[PDB]
Design an enzyme around this catalytic site. Structure first.
Site, mmCIF file in Angstrom:
data_model
loop_
_atom_site.group_PDB
_atom_site.id
_atom_site.type_symbol
_atom_site.label_atom_id
_atom_site.label_comp_id
_atom_site.label_asym_id
_atom_site.label_seq_id
_atom_site.Cartn_x
_atom_site.Cartn_y
_atom_site.Cartn_z
ATOM 1 N N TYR A 31 0.835 -1.184 0.000
ATOM 2 C CA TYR A 31 0.000 0.000 0.000
ATOM 3 C C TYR A 31 0.888 1.259 0.000
ATOM 4 O O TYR A 31 0.913 2.021 0.977
ATOM 5 C CB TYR A 31 -0.865 -0.049 1.266
ATOM 6 N N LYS B 26 -4.307 -4.572 13.963
ATOM 7 C CA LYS B 26 -4.363 -5.953 14.449
ATOM 8 C C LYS B 26 -4.402 -7.002 13.306
ATOM 9 O O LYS B 26 -3.801 -8.087 13.436
ATOM 10 C CB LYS B 26 -5.546 -6.163 15.447
ATOM 11 N N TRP C 19 6.146 3.245 16.977
ATOM 12 C CA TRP C 19 7.577 3.564 17.204
ATOM 13 C C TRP C 19 7.758 4.242 18.542
ATOM 14 O O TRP C 19 8.825 4.137 19.133
ATOM 15 C CB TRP C 19 8.151 4.428 16.078
ATOM 16 N N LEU D 59 0.249 -0.794 13.788
ATOM 17 C CA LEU D 59 -0.821 -0.491 14.737
ATOM 18 C C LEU D 59 -2.119 -1.196 14.335
ATOM 19 O O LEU D 59 -3.125 -1.037 15.021
ATOM 20 C CB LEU D 59 -1.084 1.036 14.775
ATOM 21 N N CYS E 77 -5.842 11.600 -5.958
ATOM 22 C CA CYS E 77 -4.394 11.577 -5.806
ATOM 23 C C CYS E 77 -3.723 11.567 -7.177
ATOM 24 O O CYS E 77 -2.789 12.330 -7.404
ATOM 25 C CB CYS E 77 -3.908 10.392 -4.965
ATOM 26 N N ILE F 19 8.076 2.937 5.170
ATOM 27 C CA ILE F 19 7.484 3.263 3.886
ATOM 28 C C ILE F 19 6.043 3.641 4.084
ATOM 29 O O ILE F 19 5.178 2.784 4.302
ATOM 30 C CB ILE F 19 7.624 2.077 2.911
#
Ligand SMILES: C[S@@+](CC[C@H](N)C(=O)[O-])C[C@H]1O[C@@H](n2cnc3c(N)ncnc32)[C@H](O)[C@@H]1O
EC number: 2.1.1.-
Length: 281
Positions: free
Chosen positions: A22, A86, A112, A84, A258, A125
Site C-alpha cells: 500500500y 491488528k 515507534w 498499529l 491523488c 514506507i
C-alpha cells in the site's frame, strides 16, 4: 470516530497487487507490472541501507509483511516490524513464521513511540504521514538513538508543499488541494498530516543525520494510482458487497484525486535517506 474508517483486508485486495503493498511502486524499468514494481520499490529502499548478513532491520509501519520478508530473503538479516493494525499484525505473523531462515523475525502491535530496542537499520514506507507534525523531533531522535554509529534509515512518504508555495500556482487550485489533503488525512488515513519534503529533511538534520538529496517518486505514484484506481473500478460490485457504496466511492475519490494532484504537481512523494555520522561511504 477514526474507527468508522477501518476497512477489511478483503477490500484492499480488490485494488492492491498480490504483495498487498500500500505505497508508491517503482516502475524501473517502465514495463514492470504493478507486482514487479512493488518489489523494485522495496529493493530501492533496502539497497540504500548498507545491510549486511546478521544485522537487524526495523520496519516502522510494516503493512502486510512483504518488505520484511524480502529483506530476510535478499540480505539474510533479522527483522522487527511495527504496526498499529491488528489485521496486519496477524498476517505478518504468518508471513514471517513461514520463512525458511535461521534469522530472528518479530512483528509487534505497537507504535515507534513504544519501541526502544537496538536495531542496525530502519526502513519506513508511507507510515510517516500518520505520525503528526508535533512528533517529528521525537521520531527522528528515537531512530537516531536506537541505531549504531553506522546506522542508516530510509523514509518514503507522500508530501505537500507549504501553503505559500501552493498559492504561487493560483489561489483556486491551492485551496482545492488543501481541502483534498484534509480529506486524505480524515477519511483515508485518520489523524494523519502530510509533511513537506523540507520538514522530513530538516527534522532529520536537527536529530543529527546527514541527509542526501531526496528522491522524488511522483511519476511512479501517478502510474501506481492509475493501476489501483482501474483495479478497484473493475472490482466495483465485489468492493461494495465487501463493504458499502460509501467505502467504494471514498476510495475512488482518493485514488482518482491523488492521481490528479500528483499529475498537477500539487503533491509529491519523497524517499529520504538519513545517514548517521559514522555511516559507510
Ligand atoms: C499505508 S501503510 C504502509 C505499509 C507498508 N510500509 C507498505 O508499503 O505497504 C501504513 C502503516 O503504518 C503503520 N503506522 C501508522 N502509525 C504508526 C506508528 N506511530 N508506529 C508504527 N507504525 C505506524 C500502520 O499500522 C501501517 O502498518
Amino acid at each position: 470516530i477514526q474507527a468508522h474508517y477501518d476497512v477489511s483486508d478483503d477490500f484492499f485486495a480488490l485494488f492492491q497487487d498480490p504483495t498487498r503493498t500500500y505505497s508508491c511502486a517503482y516502475f524501473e524499468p517502465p514495463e514492470l507490472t504493478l507486482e514487479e514494481a512493488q518489489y523494485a520499490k522495496v529493493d530501492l529502499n533496502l539497497d540504500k541501507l548498507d545491510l549486511k548478513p546478521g544485522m537487524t532491520l526495523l520496519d516502522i509501519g510494516c503493512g502486510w509483511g512483504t518488505t520484511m520478508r524480502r529483506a530476510v530473503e535478499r540480505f539474510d538479516v533479522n527483522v522487527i516490524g511495527l504496526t498499529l493494525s491488528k489485521n496486519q499484525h496477524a498476517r505478518c505473523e504468518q508471513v514471517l513464521a513461514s520463512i525458511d531462515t535461521n534469522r530472528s523475525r518479530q512483528v509487534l502491535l505497537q507504535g515507534w513511540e513504544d519501541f526502544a530496542e537496538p536495531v542496525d537499520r530502519i526502513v519506513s514506507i508511507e507510515a510517516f504521514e500518520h505520525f503528526g507534525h508535533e512528533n517529528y523531533d521525537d521520531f527522528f531522535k528515537r531512530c537516531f538513538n536506537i541505531m549504531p554509529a553506522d546506522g542508516r534509515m530510509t523514509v518514503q512518504s507522500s508530501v505537500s508543499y507549504h501553503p505559500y508555495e501552493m498559492a504561487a500556482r493560483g489561489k483556486k487550485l491551492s485551496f482545492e488541494t488543501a481541502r483534498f489533503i484534509k480529506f486524505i488525512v480524515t477519511e483515508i488515513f485518520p489523524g494523519g498530516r502530510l509533511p513537506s519534503t523540507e520538514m522530513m529533511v530538516e527534522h532529520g538534520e536537527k536529530a543529527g543525520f546527514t541527509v542526501p538529496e531526496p528522491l522524488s517518486l511522483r511519476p511512479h505514484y501517478i502510474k501506481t494510482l492509475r493501476i489501483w484506481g482501474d483495479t478497484l473500478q473493475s472490482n466495483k460490485d465485489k468492493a461494495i458487497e465487501v463493504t458499502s457504496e460509501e467505502v467504494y466511492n471514498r476510495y475512488m475519490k482518493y485514488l482518482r484525486g491523488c492521481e490528479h494532484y500528483f499529475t498537477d504537481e500539487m503533491l509529491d512523494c519523497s524517499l529520504v535517506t538519513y545517514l548517521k555520522p559514522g555511516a559507510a561511504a
